[PDB]
């Protein structure tokens, strides 16, 4: 299906503590494959996914120098923004960027990204047409006018449709087998007491991958999406994910409810019910 290559970059100023902390993370289909962290005696891009060690020492040297170059630009950018927003040199600020492309199953570009944020708020972004810019505030307008004059949008469109896509194709074919990895969830229902004549049924989905999943509770075949609680999907820490959804039901009516688990790893959705140990 549709795939993507994106870099999530962060620069955080640390006045009075040292140089800004600079981090660049590369993703292929929401999976981290490379990372550069300036917090090292000799920082360099490092592989984060096995299939990347297939690249030669020339690739890493080049990427590393490019990241060191961006670290410098961001260092300057942090100073520039202190001016644009009339802020002191004693506070910590953050600059973030999401740069990348998404392609279709035919390998062609579906959309490119290049968006900035200052202290957690949108700053400037390249529009879908890949020619114009959307500034978030007055400070961003100064940047917009510079980039419009220098033809920055044109430079990015060339990178997005060319370099970005070409390398994504290369990556996708090197990690395809790994990227298509699938781990089905194992589910079960737990029973918990509630004040008075009610009880809670909690449906667990454990050890699945990727994180995308849907859990539902039905009462006699109808989906119950109102008074149903659920937690955000969370990492188990071993590469797989967890999630649960619960509903409060009348004591003695547990058999009227069924849990449904939908995940791309399953041959078909899982259907479960509370099972009192015989």
């Amino acid at each position: 299906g549709p795939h993507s290559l994106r870099y999530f970059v962060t620069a955080v100023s640390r006045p009075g503590l040292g140089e800004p902390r600079f981090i660049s993370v590369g993703y292929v289909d929401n999976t981290e494959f490379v990372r550069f962290d300036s917090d090292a005696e000799n920082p360099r891009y490092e592989p984060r996914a096995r299939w990347m060690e297939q690249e030669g020492p020339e690739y890493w040297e080049r990427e590393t120098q490019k990241a060191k170059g961006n670290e410098q630009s961001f260092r300057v950018d942090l100073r520039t923004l202190l001016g644009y927003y009339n802020q002191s040199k004693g506070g910590s600020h953050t600059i973030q960027v999401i740069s990348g492309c998404e392609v279709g199953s035919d390998g062609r570009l579906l959309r490119g990204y290049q968006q900035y944020a200052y202290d957690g708020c949108d700053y400037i972004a390249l529009n879908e047409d890949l020619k114009t810019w959307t500034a978030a505030d007055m400070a961003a307008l100064i940047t917009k006018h510079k980039w419009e004059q220098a033809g920055e949008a044109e430079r990015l469109r060339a990178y997005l449709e060319g370099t970005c896509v070409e390398w994504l194709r290369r990556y996708l074919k090197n990690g395809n087998a790994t990227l298509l990895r699938t781990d089905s969830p194992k589910a079960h229902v737990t029973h918990h007491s509630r004040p008075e004549d009610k009880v809670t049924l909690r449906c667990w989905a454990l050890g699945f991958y990727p994180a995308d999943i849907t859990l539902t509770w039905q009462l006699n075949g109808e989906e119950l999406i109102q008074d149903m609680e659920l937690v955000e999907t969370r990492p188990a820490g071993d590469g797989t994910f967890q999630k649960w959804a619960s509903v409060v039901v009348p004591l003695g009516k547990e058999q009227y409810y069924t849990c449904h688990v939908y995940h791309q790893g399953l041959p078909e959705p899982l259907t479960l019910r509370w099972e009192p140990p015989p």
Binding site: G26, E63, A67, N70, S73, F74, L81, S99, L156
Partner: peptide, 8 residues
């Protein structure tokens, strides 16, 4: 591969 960012 990443792109070299322009300055703000």
């Amino acid at each position: 591969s990443s792109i070299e960012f322009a300055r703000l």
